[PDB]
C-alpha cells in the first residue's frame with residue numbers, strides 16, 4: 001500500500017483505490033494503473049520534472065529503501081494477476097529489485113522529487129507507474 005500526497009491530490013494504484021477515492025475522483029487510467037482523488041489537507045510530496053533513470057524506492061516487504069537504475073516509461077506486457085488480465089501497461093518503468101504482493105504504492109524518488117509508485121513485481125523485477133508527465137498535479 002501507499003500513496004503520493006501532492007497539493008490537494010492523493011495518487012494511488014488504481015487497483016488499490018478505496019470507495020472514498022472513487023467518491024472524490026479527479027482522474028483514473030486503467031492502462032497506467034493510476035487513480036487520483038481529492039484531499040481536504042495539503043500534502044508534502046513534490047513531483048520530479050526530469051528524465052532521471054536512477055533513484056531510490058521503498059519496499060514494504062523488506063522495510064527498506066533501495067537504490068535502483070530503471071528504464072524509461074514504456075508500454076510493457078504484464079502477466080495476469082487477480083487485479084488485471086495479461087495486458088500492456090503504459091508509462092511503466094522496470095528495475096531489478098524485490099517487489100511482492102503488498103509492495104504496490106511504495107514511492108520511487110530521484111534528486112528532483114517523486115518519480116512514481118510501485119505497480120508490478122515478481123521474478124526479481126520491480127515496475128513503477130511514472131507520474132512525471134502529469135503536470136497538472138502541480139496546480140489547482
Ligand SMILES: COC[C@]1(C(=O)N2CCC[C@H](C(N)=O)C2)CCCCO1
Pocket residue numbers: 015033078081082083084089099100101102103104118119120121122
Ligand atoms: C508488487 O506487485 C504485485 C504483483 C504484480 O506484479 N501485480 C499484481 C497487482 C497488479 C499489477 C499490475 N500493475 O498489473 C501486477 C502481484 C502478482 C505477481 C507479483 O507482483
Ligand SMILES: [Zn+2]
Pocket residue numbers: 048049050051052110111112113
Ligand atoms: Zn530526477
